[PDB]
């Protein structure tokens, strides 16, 4: 990038002009060009909002660092009716939005559905009750 | 009504989307019903034909205009039968298209065969017998014309879109079934096959610069990606609706190409389809000399007429721009002789592959003659020999104990 | 097109006149002449107005860019009686004008006919009702 | 529903955690359902395919851009059968992936074999006979293409 | 000979429309039929004479 | 003929069909007039389709 | 079948256009053409119904599977 | 100044580089950190060649860097095609500024 | 793998599993010349298409950066010929282990041609021969009393 | 040589933010609106103007 | 040095002393403008291995 020593050399040169230049016999530096892998997948199935139009979605870099931030940012959710085995009745409509990779575990699934949350809290209060 | 309009716009959309349009390729549409075209072409007939709305547009404003567009190829998008009005319309459009050097391409109605289906095309034993009756007197009189070599006809029409349904092309607005039980041909959306020929012409030009290869299975006359509708049937099931209305055997194909049609035949068990040959409506007349018969057959084939039409456009523009330059008979001989000679590949004629498509002529010969009793006016004749295309082959295999050529001698 | 250097040369010439001219040995520039394909077809069948007289229709350039503008400009329409299977009765007269290539799809066909529009809206309200 | 979403995020998580990412390796995700991908790739077909949201992203902004990322390999995360819509989607993604030199990788549905399980894969005597029927005409026409070498299943 | 009739039918039917002269057809047919003939090994061969 | 249509038209005559190879009769033919007629005709068909 | 790289090449070409094409010196791919054997036989002798008229019977593929 | 001639005024590494461009980085949603392009918009190689065919000199900005360059210098003149390829070459050379400076 | 799939098969009684081969969706067409058939088969295998795709990325970037430098046909021949030749291991081709994975090409050949009627525009062809990978092996074992190669002669 | 900048209005744009919108720029300059522009580019004195 | 070669043709104007006409043919150093590359996966190199 033409070292300022070259500016001093070509512009107003002292009788003694001393420059330092890196020695490369054949030049031709490496091309670099990292390997990127674009991934397309169906995420946030049945969202609650219109979400985003195409061509505005882009491709978002992902890694182990932002993964949970990519879930929480993308807000993947699921809403469906399921038979209620707890107290007869019929289909139970549940709405779940997973904000972390741990939210697919059955514990977090139980904590997100409000009824199963009340039952799970009941169990933690009784099991915590049997021990002092 | 909805099937007619849908098929019109669907065919036009097929032509537009499948064409690579740029500075070189353009597509200009004129919306005119067949009754209106026959009407306006009926108003001006005989002498007055030189003055018509259609002739003005096609010839005056473009091929006749200074610095216009010679208009290339024309696509009819109409179904023409042997009826008096359709014979008149074809006669007139053959006059116009012949004047402007712009081959006319359209589809032949199923009623030409006294059929009305194209599902019955396999029923008759001989198609050449159909056109003998006096009913076709007008048709035969049309094919005998010298202006009819500018009209191609593609009888079968390809399938425009795949029937809506959960299995195929689901609508996704509401649960929808298109019915369209096997065959019967009335439920399916059929696009005119003049547009598949048109797409082939535009493709040929885009790739090779010329419309020379618009036919053949592997020579560029292929129509790919056709919708294949597969419906279950009895027993093993799994039989698909033919993309073109009916399958045409090689015998039927040659028999239609003899009658001046351009069949679109569908390859069995595949969505592929092709134009085996492009033969204009003109019936080439036989002659005593086999050379005259050859020249008479070449003129009836669209692949060559596109070449000569293109040379007509070029010559029109370049000579129109050369008007006013100092020229003698010898000067015009050198300029025309050396102008036509850059579209001919002399050294590589036997060994070449794609350049034979880019250079349409195997040889070229110019005879210039100055008009007597006038300066600056000349008469020229361009003899240009096109590259031949394989048309047919009869093979007789012989089991031989001693080879007759070399072993036996 | 006779470069201004030629004007300086022929008109009042300096003793030293320096012009630049492109070198073409044989001249004879290419003819160009793009390939246009004129298409004639029956469009806007049974229009609502007199439309346009012949010789005033011309040829309009079409491509993938203006295609929908060519439909919407041309206003292709269709009007006919059709048996009404919805509620007995008899022929149902429908008037449809297609402003886009998507208007030939069965969904848009249903949206354009007013009765089928009411039924389709009913279906979207019920199917949207079964889900939250 | 929960099995579908769970499998999607669980697969993506497997890809992320088992990959050693640095300056050299990147992973870019685009969330687009198979219906949306087939829809946007259906809007632009034939001539207009050069202009698409997917082609813009994959080719223009990266492989076509000055000083961009040529995008390497692409992973579908979809189940493609011989159906007309899936043959169209594979045709188009083969055009894009062929243009950008980015092989497309996805999974083949159990319905390609007329199966729907992959538990029945041992039942048929000959798999090459399955693809002969006219039902697969679109599939065979796809495999014969020269742009299909960019699609693994 | 029947098999050669099938082959010739299909391959020529697919070659219809390609630029061909008499010499071009001579080279294509001559070189097409010549891959079913074993010239050098005619006296010494066993299974290839069947193939 | 129904037999000639099936054997020749739909396969050996069709574009992209199956030239049908060899044909097997599974019939017992004697010198009787009807069997000589049947063999004559099947020889015409089989000769036309190279089968 | 003209790879989309050719579309990018001929249609609007970058200054650097990189295509991949399979190398075939002599081209001329094999004809394929499987060997089918049509079999005619007397089956369903003395049927209970009219069965089917000729030209509607066709030829049905058979194997160990069906 | 460097070479005594205006011959190399184009190319990325051939002397058509525009360096040190102001890079304005503003936070956006999620990960943030996206910068305003120094030239008004990013031009793809296809857009670049398509503009150079139309007689423009695009200044295209290298992605994620303050660097930018002139890929080619094409004058406003549309060079005419000729029969002889040598005449077409001479006609193309005249339309390029790097030579006209010489 | 003949039908253009990439099976993931599980090793019995173990949690291990593997991809035996990577075959793209494309059905490679047969040709008269066995060399053309070989080249047609190589193109259908993803392991090689990744190599050529990577060379496409590299070539795109490096040539895009070389636009505007003084170049003749011979200069481009030397620069492309010597650029492709650092991914080829010439001396160690038969004896190497991991470098055959790092250098994907056994040989490379460049044919440069200048476009007529235009300065500064060139057409190039890159012929690159990849390192072959074992695909299959048919073995016929023979119990022999006298070795046919050496003992019997 | 004359060097200047081409307005965003040459493309019928007025931004240069919309430069990515059109599919083909070569089609923009075909219209008769640009007749003067095309007549300028065809000139032999226009090779002295960069934009 | 911008020129790879240079050629001068001098001609004296007839009907006048001391006035001359000259033509300078100067061939510039070409600059890389574009490159189309077709990569080919090849089993036997067509240039050397296959010959």
């Amino acid at each position: 990038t033409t070292s300022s020593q070259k500016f001093i050399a070509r512009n107003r040169a002292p009788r003694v002009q001393i420059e330092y230049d890196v020695e490369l016999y054949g030049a031709e530096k490496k091309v670099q060009l990292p390997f990127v892998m674009g991934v397309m997948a169906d995420l946030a199935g049945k969202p609650a909002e219109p979400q985003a139009a195409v061509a505005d979605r882009k491709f978002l870099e992902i890694d182990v660092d932002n993964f949970d931030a990519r879930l929480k940012a993308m807000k993947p959710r699921v809403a469906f009716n399921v038979p209620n085995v707890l107290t007869g009745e019929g289909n139970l409509s549940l709405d779940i939005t997973f904000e972390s990779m741990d939210d697919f575990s059955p514990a977090a699934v139980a904590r997100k559905v409000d009824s199963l949350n009340k039952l799970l809290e009941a169990r933690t209060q009784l099991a915590n009750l049997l021990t002092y | 009504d909805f099937q007619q309009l849908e098929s019109a716009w669907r065919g036009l959309h097929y032509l537009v989307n499948n064409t690579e349009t740029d500075e070189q390729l353009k597509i200009r549409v004129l919306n005119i019903s067949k009754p209106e075209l026959h009407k306006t072409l009926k108003k001006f007939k005989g002498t007055t034909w030189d003055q018509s709305p259609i002739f003005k547009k096609l010839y005056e404003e473009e091929y006749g205009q200074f610095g216009g567009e010679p208009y290339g190829c024309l696509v009819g998008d109409y179904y023409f039968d042997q009826s008096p009005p359709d014979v008149e319309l074809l006669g007139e459009m053959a006059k116009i298209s012949a004047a402007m050097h712009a081959p006319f391409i359209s589809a032949a109605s199923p009623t030409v065969m006294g059929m009305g289906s194209w599902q019955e095309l396999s029923n008759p034993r001989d198609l050449t017998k159909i056109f003998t009756t006096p009913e076709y007197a007008g048709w035969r009189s049309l094919r005998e014309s010298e202006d009819s070599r500018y009209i191609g006809l593609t009888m079968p029409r390809f399938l425009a879109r795949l029937p809506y349904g959960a299995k195929t092309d689901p609508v996704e607005e509401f649960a929808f079934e298109e019915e369209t039980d096997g065959a019967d041909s009335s439920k399916y959306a059929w696009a005119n096959s003049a547009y598949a020929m048109a797409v082939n012409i535009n493709r040929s030009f885009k790739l090779y610069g010329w419309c020379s290869r618009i036919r053949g299975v592997e020579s560029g006359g292929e129509v790919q990606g056709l919708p294949a509708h597969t419906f279950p049937t009895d027993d093993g099931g799994v039989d698909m609706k033919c993309p073109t209305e009916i399958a045409i055997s090689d015998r039927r194909e040659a028999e239609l190409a003899k009658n001046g049609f351009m069949p679109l035949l569908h390859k069995k068990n595949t969505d592929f389809a092709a134009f085996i040959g492009a033969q204009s409506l003109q019936k080439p007349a036989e002659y005593d000399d086999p050379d005259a018969t050859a020249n008479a057959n070449l003129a009836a084939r669209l692949p060559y007429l596109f070449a000569t039409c293109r040379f007509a456009h070029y010559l029109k523009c370049i000579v129109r721009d050369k008007i006013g330059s100092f020229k003698e008979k010898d000067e015009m001989q050198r300029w025309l002789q050396d102008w036509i000679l850059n579209y001919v590949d002399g050294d590589p004629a036997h060994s070449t592959e794609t350049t034979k498509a880019q250079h349409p002529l195997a040889a070229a010969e110019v005879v210039v003659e100055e008009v007597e009793g006038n300066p600056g006016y000349y008469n020229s004749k361009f003899f240009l020999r096109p590259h031949y295309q394989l048309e047919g082959l009869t093979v007789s295999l012989r089991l031989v104990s001693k080879l007759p050529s070399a072993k036996e001698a």
Side-chain angles (χ1 to χ4, degrees), chain A, chain B:
Chain A
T1 320
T2 203
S3 37
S4 55
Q5 305 171 349
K6 260 67 174 187
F7 177 89
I8 304 291
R10 97 180 73 90
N11 209 97
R12 283 176 283 275
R15 318 180 89 109
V16 176
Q17 165 70 9
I18 309 178
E19 324 141 355
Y20 175 79
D21 64 330
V22 178
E23 168 57 30
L24 21 84
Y25 316 77
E28 212 46 17
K29 58 175 67 178
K30 283 195 177 177
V31 175
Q32 208 61 34
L33 188 147
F35 176 90
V36 186
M37 185 182 56
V39 183
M40 284 169 281
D42 176 32
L43 309 173
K46 192 184 299 181
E49 298 295 337
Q51 203 185 350
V54 175
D56 300 332
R57 287 190 169 103
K58 50 176 45 192
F59 271 72
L60 305 154
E61 185 163 307
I62 207 171
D63 49 47
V64 292
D65 299 319
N66 50 22
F67 196 87
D68 289 341
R70 291 307 190 196
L71 275 66
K72 185 184 169 51
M74 201 170 300
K75 309 165 189 199
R77 71 179 282 272
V78 176
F80 66 98
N81 301 332
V82 72
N84 178 280
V85 286
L86 289 58
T87 47
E89 195 188 9
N91 291 20
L92 171 59
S93 300
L94 62 78
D95 180 0
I96 295 180
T97 80
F98 309 95
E99 299 189 357
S100 306
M101 201 69 251
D102 299 0
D103 291 5
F104 286 84
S105 59
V109 167
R111 298 188 302 177
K112 282 185 175 300
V113 178
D114 189 17
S115 60
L116 282 68
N117 175 33
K118 298 299 185 182
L119 289 189
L120 177 62
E121 291 294 334
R123 186 227 179 260
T124 61
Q125 289 170 359
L126 265 60
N128 213 326
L129 169 63
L130 69 88
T131 299
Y132 289 81
Chain B
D1 306 344
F2 193 98
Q3 284 184 348
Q4 182 168 1
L5 190 64
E6 166 191 3
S7 60
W9 281 106
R10 207 159 287 276
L12 177 60
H13 186 268
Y14 174 85
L15 175 56
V16 169
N17 271 26
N18 291 94
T19 307
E20 313 186 4
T21 49
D22 48 306
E23 270 193 340
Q24 299 301 292
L25 282 77
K26 306 209 312 174
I27 307 165
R28 306 185 68 178
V29 201
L30 163 69
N31 66 324
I32 179 169
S33 55
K34 192 160 157 309
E36 281 183 354
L37 188 54
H38 170 253
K39 175 198 191 151
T40 64
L41 297 173
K42 202 183 180 302
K43 307 292 181 180
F44 313 94
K45 200 175 171 62
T47 297
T48 293
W49 84 269
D50 195 18
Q51 281 61 33
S52 57
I54 314 299
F55 183 86
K56 293 286 206 193
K57 300 174 186 316
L58 296 179
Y59 188 95
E60 292 296 335
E61 304 187 35
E62 295 292 340
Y63 179 75
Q65 177 59 11
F66 175 64
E69 310 291 349
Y71 246 110
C73 169
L74 199 66
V75 163
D77 184 12
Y78 298 133
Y79 301 111
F80 299 109
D81 74 324
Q82 71 286 0
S83 60
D86 289 344
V87 178
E88 292 177 6
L89 196 51
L90 287 187
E92 217 63 28
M93 291 301 310
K95 290 177 189 173
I96 306 172
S97 61
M100 60 181 310
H101 303 252
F104 188 65
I105 308 298
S106 50
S109 180
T111 52
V112 184
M113 307 290 176
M115 200 163 292
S117 69
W118 285 140
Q119 305 294 143
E120 305 174 351
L121 188 52
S122 57
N123 297 340
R125 67 167 282 274
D126 196 335
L127 299 170
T128 299
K129 182 200 188 160
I130 301 183
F131 304 114
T132 305
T133 72
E135 186 173 3
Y136 299 84
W139 186 270
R140 297 136 47 182
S141 302
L142 166 62
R143 302 195 49 195
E144 293 283 341
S145 173
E146 209 165 13
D147 285 329
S148 69
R149 59 168 150 263
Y150 290 94
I151 308 178
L153 295 173
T154 63
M155 68 193 88
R157 54 189 197 271
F158 69 90
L159 195 58
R161 61 154 170 82
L162 204 58
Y164 299 106
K167 313 216 67 183
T168 66
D169 196 350
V171 63
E172 63 185 342
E173 183 59 347
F174 67 85
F176 181 55
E177 292 308 302
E178 204 174 331
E179 194 62 29
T180 186
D181 53 330
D184 297 328
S185 297
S186 300
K187 312 299 181 179
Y188 299 75
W190 300 99
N192 188 320
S193 62
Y195 289 121
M197 193 43 164
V199 163
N200 294 10
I201 304 164
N202 300 27
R203 174 199 306 163
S204 172
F205 178 77
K206 179 70 178 178
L207 310 179
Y208 306 98
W210 300 81
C211 314
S212 187
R213 36 179 40 202
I214 43 180
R215 54 165 306 191
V217 179
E218 300 180 359
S219 76
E222 63 266 4
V223 175
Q224 298 173 356
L226 287 181
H229 176 253
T230 67
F231 61 97
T233 185
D234 61 330
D235 301 334
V238 190
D239 60 325
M240 76 171 181
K241 174 65 177 185
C242 192
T244 75
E245 302 198 46
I246 203 185
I248 284 182
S249 59
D250 295 338
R251 294 178 86 201
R252 275 281 190 267
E253 180 273 347
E255 198 158 29
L256 293 152
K258 185 201 201 153
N259 293 333
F261 297 88
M262 283 189 294
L264 175 65
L265 42 78
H266 163 244
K267 193 192 190 76
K268 183 83 167 298
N269 290 7
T270 48
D271 61 346
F272 183 94
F275 295 86
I276 302 303
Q279 289 276 331
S280 50
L281 194 53
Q282 180 180 0
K283 171 161 42 178
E286 300 180 0
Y287 290 84
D288 300 332
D289 196 36
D291 296 318
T293 309
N295 306 326
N297 281 272
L298 300 176
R301 300 179 186 168
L302 290 168
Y304 310 103
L305 263 199
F306 277 107
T308 61
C309 286
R310 190 67 180 180
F311 284 108
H313 299 345
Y314 275 165
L315 219 38
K316 171 86 166 198
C317 290
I318 187 177
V319 174
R320 170 164 58 189
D321 292 20
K322 272 291 196 201
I323 294 303
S325 63
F326 306 98
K327 293 296 184 182
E328 306 290 339
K329 164 185 297 187
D330 301 329
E331 295 302 320
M332 289 296 301
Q333 174 67 31
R334 299 187 306 104
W335 170 59
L336 294 178
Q337 186 74 14
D338 284 30
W339 176 85
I340 196 66
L341 227 54
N342 55 30
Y343 301 108
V344 178
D345 60 356
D347 300 0
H350 293 78
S351 309
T352 52
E353 71 281 5
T354 187
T355 57
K356 303 193 185 313
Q358 287 186 352
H359 301 251
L361 314 182
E365 175 71 27
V366 177
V367 175
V368 177
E369 180 65 30
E370 180 180 1
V371 162
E372 68 166 347
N374 199 331
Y377 278 90
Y378 302 97
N379 289 337
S380 67
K381 292 197 160 147
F382 278 75
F383 309 93
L384 21 84
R385 183 190 184 279
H387 285 105
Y388 291 164
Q389 307 185 22
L390 186 67
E391 294 296 339
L393 188 65
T394 58
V395 181
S396 64
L397 318 160
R398 298 157 179 261
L399 279 173
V400 173
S401 295
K402 189 178 189 188
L403 289 186
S405 63
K407 289 172 183 175
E408 183 151 1

